[PDB]
Amino acid sequence: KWKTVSTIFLVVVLYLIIGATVFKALEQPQEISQRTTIVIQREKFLRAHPCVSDQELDELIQQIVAAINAGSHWDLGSSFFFAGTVITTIGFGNISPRTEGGKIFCIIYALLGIPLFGFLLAGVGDQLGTIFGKGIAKVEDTFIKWNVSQTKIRIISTIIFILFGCVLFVALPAVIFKHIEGWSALDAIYFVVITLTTIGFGDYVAGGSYKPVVWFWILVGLAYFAAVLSMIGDWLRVIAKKTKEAVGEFRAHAAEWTANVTS
Amino acid sequence: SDSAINVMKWKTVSTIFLVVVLYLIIGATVFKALEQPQEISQRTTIVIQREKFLRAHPCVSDQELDELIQQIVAAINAGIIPLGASSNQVSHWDLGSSFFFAGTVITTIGFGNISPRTEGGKIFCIIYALLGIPLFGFLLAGVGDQLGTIFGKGIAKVEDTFIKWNSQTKIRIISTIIFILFGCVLFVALPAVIFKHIEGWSALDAIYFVVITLTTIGVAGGSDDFYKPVVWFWILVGLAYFAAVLSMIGDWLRVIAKKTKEAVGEFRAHA
Ligand SMILES: CCCCCCCO[C@@H]1O[C@H](CO)[C@@H](O)[C@H](O)[C@H]1O
Ligand SMILES: CCCCCCCO[C@@H]1O[C@H](CO)[C@@H](O)[C@H](O)[C@H]1O
Ligand SMILES: CCCCCCCCCCCCCCCC
Ligand SMILES: CCCCCCCCCCCC
Ligand SMILES: CCCCCCCCCCCC
Ligand SMILES: CCCCCCCCCCCC
Ligand SMILES: CCCCCCCCCC
Ligand SMILES: CCCCCCCC
Ligand SMILES: [K+]
Ligand SMILES: [K+]
Ligand SMILES: [K+]
């Protein structure tokens, strides 16, 4: 009977409206600086070469925008990586199928590969969850009868989870993907979160300016954030009830307050 | 007995791992047999237009022409209309696009081609996703249950208008067909038919769009403002629809797993 979904719907709508104003307050500034200087390279290029004219630079952009549709890809291994992005729903989509048969196959290949891969990820999650269960069984005997109480013991372990998990999964896999002479510090964490949350794989680089072991870290990392996101959902559930009781309690005191004023 | 079921679980996981490995190898060979031919025809003819347009203007910087193309392709990763006509441009981080961007983040659909460049935008996006993805899941789960009872009501009338004389175990299969029928007509067919008249997508390219989107794999939004809010709410319920569809397909694979798991066991035993 009681819906309770529309209230969550409004929070999500409100959460998006906040996120909207924040992203445009962080990205629209740099959007101007780029796109004002892009005019500068176009204004400089026609001056640097009277050989090429206005009518001809548009033709080049057209022929480069036409090349966006294509970009050797689809080789023995690239189509393997593509199929991995499909069943993991990461789907970076820089190289997407252009053939009618390739799209029809991709529809069926996804409708069957996504559930199939789900059983793998679920089994890897349980398999890795017990590995973590053994790792805490030794930690939950050598530190428990000490002074840290029942409600606090649970928190030290969750810190050891986040630190030992995230430090592994932001340092090694992002680099094990492209492993030496590492990277910018932030774009490794940004790469990992965007990838393992199945959001879309932050910008493959080929250095213009391993197969079982790499998909190991991916499969373990996807299972890692699968639990990480699920815990965050649990902490949101707690904070939901803690804020549910606070309002109904404040609305309870403000109600009898108003009755006292009517005297 | 405690770690005896785990001796039995690890066997089941690695076999599913091998199925996934082989499933990717099959998929790999199928895509590269369908797409790599069209790639050769494209790259051989894109060299022709370099060999054409560079002989058509020898006075352009030959060795530096590739550097211009890189700097143009590097600009493609961001929003660009770098042309002599229409130097005026529109922001892809405007009032409504960054709203759509946040939607692709919490739904994990993802980014189209453009992603945040600012360090502050990347740090916020990490926090926004780690909190937005779980938040959205509660909505999607509530939408699924809210939609599941609407289906439970719609099937309650259908499961009485066909109750003749004589079973319980068989009516459940008719109910799953009327799910896929109404479901794929409402959530896959009707919107795919509507996108034909808006962006001119071929018949397949609309279904392919719906599947890739609502299976959160990852554009009709640009038209160059009355239907984007409606489509967004189609997406929310369509995401809840494929959530169950993918879940059923997984259950169908559990059945097909055991039926083949028992078939090999008997064929090995009797022979
Ligand atoms: C600049 C300070 C770097 C602090 C870390 C010191 C170790 O460097 C790393 O050594 C690794 C090989 O063992 C390689 O991955 C890279 O050559 C390098 O990244
Ligand atoms: C147990 C997992 C072992 C995985 C091996 C990964 C291969 O990377 C190597 O591992 C070293 C740290 O281990 C790095 O410092 C080196 O840069 C690199 O040569
Ligand atoms: C980017 C972070 C967004 C934070 C949004 C906080 C919204 C809080 C909603 C408060 C309303 C809850 C109503 C509960 C009624 C019982
Ligand atoms: C115009 C042709 C469209 C063909 C669509 C085929 C869909 C296949 C569904 C497979 C379900 C597992
Ligand atoms: C940093 C705070 C982010 C928002 C966390 C709470 C969002 C939901 C609370 C209300 C749920 C009913
Ligand atoms: C594209 C579908 C691939 C199907 C592969 C079937 C593999 C079954 C192996 C049976 C082992 C018991
Ligand atoms: C380098 C600038 C960091 C900006 C972080 C913005 C966080 C906003 C949280 C509401
Ligand atoms: C129908 C293709 C998947 C194979 C099902 C059997 C998995 C053990
Ligand atoms: K998913
Ligand atoms: K996804
Ligand atoms: K995605």
Side-chain angles (χ1 to χ4, degrees), chain A, chain B residues 1-41 43-271:
Chain A
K1 296 295 289 183
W2 54 94
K3 185 183 291 292
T4 310
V5 176
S6 66
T7 61
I8 300 169
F9 178 75
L10 295 175
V11 176
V12 175
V13 173
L14 185 147
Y15 185 76
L16 292 171
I17 296 169
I18 294 173
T21 60
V22 175
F23 280 107
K24 70 178 183 180
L26 292 173
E27 294 295 327
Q28 189 174 3
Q30 288 185 356
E31 189 179 4
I32 303 167
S33 66
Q34 295 177 357
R35 288 160 61 249
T36 56
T37 57
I38 293 168
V39 177
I40 296 170
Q41 288 97 23
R42 190 178 70 248
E43 188 68 26
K44 183 178 179 181
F45 180 74
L46 277 73
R47 294 181 184 272
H49 294 89
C51 181
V52 177
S53 66
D54 175 73
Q55 182 65 41
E56 296 177 355
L57 185 145
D58 190 0
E59 295 176 354
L60 183 63
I61 302 298
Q62 293 176 357
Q63 295 174 356
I64 294 170
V65 173
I68 298 171
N69 293 318
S72 178
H73 294 285
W74 299 101
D75 64 1
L76 61 88
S78 297
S79 65
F80 182 80
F81 179 76
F82 177 77
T85 61
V86 174
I87 65 169
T88 61
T89 63
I90 295 170
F92 178 59
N94 58 0
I95 292 94
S96 65
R98 299 289 182 267
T99 304
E100 292 181 354
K103 292 181 181 179
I104 296 169
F105 180 75
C106 184
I107 293 169
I108 299 169
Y109 189 79
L111 292 173
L112 296 175
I114 296 169
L116 177 63
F117 183 76
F119 291 103
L120 178 62
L121 186 64
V124 173
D126 184 74
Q127 186 65 255
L128 185 64
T130 61
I131 296 169
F132 183 75
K134 292 181 181 180
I136 57 91
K138 293 182 183 293
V139 177
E140 289 181 353
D141 287 329
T142 60
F143 300 106
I144 307 303
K145 290 293 180 69
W146 278 263
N147 56 9
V148 179
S149 296
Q150 294 179 356
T151 61
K152 288 184 180 291
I153 288 295
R154 187 72 66 193
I155 298 170
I156 292 94
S157 66
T158 59
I159 297 169
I160 299 169
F161 180 82
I162 296 170
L163 66 89
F164 193 76
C166 185
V167 171
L168 264 66
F169 288 107
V170 301
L172 298 175
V175 181
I176 292 171
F177 188 74
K178 301 277 101 173
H179 190 87
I180 276 170
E181 296 168 353
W183 196 238
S184 66
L186 178 61
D187 292 330
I189 298 168
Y190 178 75
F191 175 75
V192 172
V193 177
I194 297 300
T195 300
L196 296 175
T197 56
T198 65
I199 295 175
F201 187 73
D203 289 332
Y204 163 73
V205 176
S209 66
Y210 53 81
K211 295 181 176 67
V213 178
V214 175
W215 286 99
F216 166 74
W217 295 99
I218 298 169
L219 183 62
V220 176
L222 291 171
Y224 179 72
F225 287 177
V228 172
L229 293 172
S230 180
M231 296 186 295
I232 296 170
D234 292 331
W235 292 97
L236 293 174
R237 178 185 58 80
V238 175
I239 300 168
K241 291 182 181 180
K242 300 298 291 294
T243 59
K244 183 178 184 293
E245 65 184 2
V247 175
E249 184 175 359
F250 169 66
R251 291 292 191 270
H253 295 288
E256 203 276 332
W257 182 82
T258 302
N260 291 319
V261 175
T262 61
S263 67
Chain B
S1 66
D2 186 74
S3 66
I5 55 91
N6 296 114
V7 174
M8 305 301 172
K9 289 181 180 179
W10 188 75
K11 293 181 181 180
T12 303
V13 176
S14 66
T15 57
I16 296 170
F17 177 76
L18 296 175
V19 175
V20 173
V21 172
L22 295 175
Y23 183 75
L24 293 174
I25 297 168
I26 295 169
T29 60
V30 174
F31 284 108
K32 68 183 180 181
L34 293 173
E35 295 295 328
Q36 189 174 3
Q38 296 294 321
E39 183 180 2
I40 298 169
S41 67
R43 183 174 290 174
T44 56
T45 59
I46 200 66
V47 174
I48 295 169
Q49 288 183 355
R50 176 176 287 174
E51 296 294 328
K52 179 181 178 181
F53 200 78
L54 192 148
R55 303 294 294 167
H57 297 90
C59 47
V60 72
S61 295
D62 177 75
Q63 296 175 356
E64 293 179 354
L65 182 62
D66 299 334
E67 296 176 354
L68 182 65
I69 298 169
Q70 291 181 356
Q71 294 177 356
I72 294 168
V73 174
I76 293 170
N77 297 115
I80 57 168
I81 302 93
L83 298 176
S86 69
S87 67
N88 55 4
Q89 294 173 356
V90 178
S91 177
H92 290 284
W93 294 99
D94 63 359
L95 60 88
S97 297
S98 66
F99 183 80
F100 178 76
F101 178 78
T104 63
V105 175
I106 66 170
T107 61
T108 64
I109 297 170
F111 293 170
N113 283 318
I114 54 93
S115 67
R117 295 291 188 184
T118 306
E119 290 181 352
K122 292 180 182 179
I123 295 169
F124 179 74
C125 183
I126 295 169
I127 297 169
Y128 191 79
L130 292 173
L131 296 175
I133 296 168
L135 177 62
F136 182 75
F138 290 101
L139 178 61
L140 186 65
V143 172
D145 183 74
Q146 190 70 41
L147 184 65
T149 61
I150 297 169
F151 179 75
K153 294 178 183 179
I155 196 64
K157 298 188 292 294
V158 176
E159 290 181 353
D160 285 330
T161 60
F162 295 101
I163 301 299
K164 295 181 176 67
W165 197 72
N166 190 359
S167 66
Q168 295 178 357
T169 186
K170 293 180 182 179
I171 297 167
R172 305 294 294 165
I173 298 169
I174 293 93
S175 65
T176 59
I177 297 169
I178 201 67
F179 178 79
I180 299 169
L181 185 61
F182 276 103
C184 294
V185 169
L186 273 70
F187 295 104
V188 177
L190 293 176
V193 174
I194 295 169
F195 293 172
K196 173 61 177 291
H197 298 285
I198 298 170
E199 284 289 327
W201 286 346
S202 66
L204 179 64
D205 291 331
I207 298 168
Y208 177 76
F209 180 77
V210 174
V211 175
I212 297 299
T213 299
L214 294 175
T215 58
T216 186
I217 297 171
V219 178
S223 66
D224 291 331
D225 190 73
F226 295 173
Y227 87 102
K228 287 177 70 176
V230 176
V231 172
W232 182 76
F233 176 66
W234 165 67
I235 296 168
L236 179 61
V237 187
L239 290 172
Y241 178 71
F242 286 179
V245 174
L246 292 173
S247 179
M248 296 186 293
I249 297 169
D251 291 331
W252 295 347
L253 293 173
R254 290 289 88 192
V255 176
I256 297 169
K258 290 184 182 292
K259 301 294 183 182
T260 59
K261 186 175 176 67
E262 66 183 1
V264 176
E266 295 179 355
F267 170 67
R268 178 67 181 89
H270 294 284

